[PDB]
């Protein structure tokens, strides 16, 4: 199962959204549940937009798309640690 790993990956992605004052672990769990229960990028984005009005739609879509891409990489055998490392790099915008 990939659910526990995906939750950690989504929480890392959420940590990179500036001034996103929310309980990251619960938002990550919510996103992962919506996906597991058959959600699409659009249905998940729409549910998030109603909850978090301050964040732009493109930022939310970016988080959800990352979740779907990460699920696929996990199914393709990529380790969660490697995925997290790439997200940290994107969040920091630095090779270092």
């Amino acid at each position: 199962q990939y659910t526990e790993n995906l939750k950690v990956i989504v929480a890392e992605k959420l940590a990179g959204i500036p001034n996103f004052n929310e309980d990251i672990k619960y938002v990550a769990e919510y996103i992962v549940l919506l996906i597991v229960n058959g959600g699409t990028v659009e249905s998940v984005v729409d549910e998030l937009a109603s909850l978090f009005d301050s964040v732009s739609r493109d930022t939310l879509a970016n988080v959800v798309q990352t979740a779907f891409f990460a699920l696929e990489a996990l199914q393709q055998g990529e380790s969660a640690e490697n995925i997290v490392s790439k997200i940290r790099m994107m969040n920091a915008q630095s090779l270092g």
Partner: peptide, 25 residues
């Protein structure tokens, strides 16, 4: 913000029940 967190918790619980209903089938 207390209200928003209660809402998110309620929504998570709803999704957990949906997942359970799917597994039972």
């Amino acid at each position: 913000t207390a209200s928003k967190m209660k809402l998110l918790k309620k929504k998570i619980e709803e999704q957990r029940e949906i997942l359970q209903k799917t597994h039972h089938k």
